[PDB]
Design a protein around this ligand. Structure first.
Ligand SMILES: CNC(=O)CSc1nc2c(=O)[nH]c(N)nc2[nH]1
Ligand SMILES: CNC(=O)CSc1nc2c(=O)[nH]c(N)nc2[nH]1
Lengths: 273, 264
């Protein structure tokens, strides 16, 4: 299983760590320095995000997002060999990012914005499709499912169809159940517990649980006290064959993933279920 | 539903338990303070031994081992509700430990010293059977065969199967690939229908993989603990209790959301 972009490939025969590079508010210098620490810690993908997708967040203008994100994507693509995912919903950010070297479009809205689907298709880049109920402004008010796994799974069916029909080949797609995006605690753990069952699509799985409420609410601790919980989440996901793990704490996660890889390669079928 | 019974209390093995490692080196005050810290971090068992009971540590006389071990076990038993695991191979220490409140006999030698088997049987206490001998044809099958034999050996000495715990003994005459093969197939040891205990904390199976020293192995230790607990391991022996307890609560939330309650 591989992805292809900007004349390189990403080998998904083992898990990859994706370092989080938040550029919501010298910012260019610091971002490049942070990217560098994460690369040295073993991150093979950097996720550059210029719009807060947190519960309650206000939208960011196209002009603000471009200014925050494009110089950062460019600088990294110029200096390092690492892959770059862009955490955006905007057609113009999608277009400009591809032009300065981004490898993956990571859209929490699964290209739902007017023009986003067509822009993503024109770039030819890999596209991550994430599940969210509602939108970031109200998703966490009262998340509700009869069956969270089935509803997330149905959603991936439809979005894969939607993408294929715009001329995005299945082989460019990644799936992400969207931990925290319109989900209470028990919804999140139902998804994590059944994560291996999303392999039926035969597509890369991407997960982001790092320092999120599904850890905080379980342990009753703030964002800075969540590393152990985050590693546990990462290991649980990678033990079930998750291909990319989106995290804040790269070094610790990479060490944990090495242990998982040694375990999985000793196994005769290469995955837990 | 799995439970152990000892010293008028019980251990509920429907979820995983973190066992904290206690170094025995006044020293009694310090041991109790360290027990307190691990209990407050959420350990429900304390394993009395640590550095002094590691492989290669200096052997001690019966008299010395009683003087260092018995007062510690007694002190914890008087002050806390926590279960107490005792690291010993000597029948006298097994006997005296039981008299002052120990709950589990954790002998890395599987009661092989003269009299140790008979002493453990007289206590009525739970006993951990750990594999130790690196070369194997099939490391899992050798370890598995070893459990069959030690289970029988204990049953024959009058120790009921319900008092036994099984430990594959990570790092004990095992190279890196042997250790990871055991960890990869840990769930298969559930066919004995006995508790599984594992100890990977800060071991060379992490140090050699990551190429880091003993104080830099927390992330790998946590990964190992999570991998074992996701496969239904019941007791996890560790140095870093708080962090392990936190990882275990994540594992519990995950296993509670599953219909099957274990990964394989
Ligand atoms: C502290 N919370 C955050 O980091 C929220 S931002 C964010 N989360 C995710 C995620 O779970 N998956 C993907 N693909 N992209 C994401 N972007
Ligand atoms: C840094 N190395 C150590 O902690 C070696 S001492 C030790 N290991 C184990 C183990 O794996 N299982 C049990 N039951 N008892 C043990 N005692």
């Amino acid at each position: 299983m591989k992805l292809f972009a900007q004349g390189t490939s990403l080998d998904l025969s083992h898990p990859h760590v994706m370092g989080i590079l938040n550029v919501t508010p010298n910012s260019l210098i610091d971002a490049v320095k942070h990217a560098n620490l994460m690369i040295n810690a073993g991150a093979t993908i950097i996720d550059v995000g210029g719009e807060s997708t947190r519960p309650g967040a206000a939208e960011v203008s196209v002009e603000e997002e471009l200014q925050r994100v494009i110089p950062v994507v460019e600088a990294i693509a110029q200096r390092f060999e690492v892959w770059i995912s862009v955490d955006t919903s905007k057609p113009e950010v999608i277009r400009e990012s591809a032009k300065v070297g981004a490898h993956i479009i990571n859209d929490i809205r699964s290209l739902s914005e007017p023009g986003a689907l067509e822009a993503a298709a024109e770039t030819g880049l890999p596209v991550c499709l994430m599940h969210m109920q509602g939108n970031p402004k109200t998703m966490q008010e009262a998340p509700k499912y009869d069956d969270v796994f089935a509803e997330v799974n149905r959603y991936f069916i439809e979005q894969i169809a939607r993408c294929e029909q715009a001329g995005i080949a299945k082989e460019k797609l990644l799936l992400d159940p969207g931990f925290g995006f319109g989900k209470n605690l028990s919804h999140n753990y139902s998804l994590l517990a059944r994560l291996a069952e999303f392999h039926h699509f035969n597509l890369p799985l991407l997960v982001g649980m790092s320092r999120k409420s599904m850890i905080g609410q379980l342990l009753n601790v703030g964002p800075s006290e969540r590393l152990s919980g985050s590693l546990a989440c990462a290991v649980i996901a990678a033990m079930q064959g998750a291909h990319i793990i989106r995290v804040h704490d790269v070094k610790e996660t990479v060490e944990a993933m090495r242990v998982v890889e040694a375990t999985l390669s000793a196994k005769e079928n290469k995955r837990y279920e």
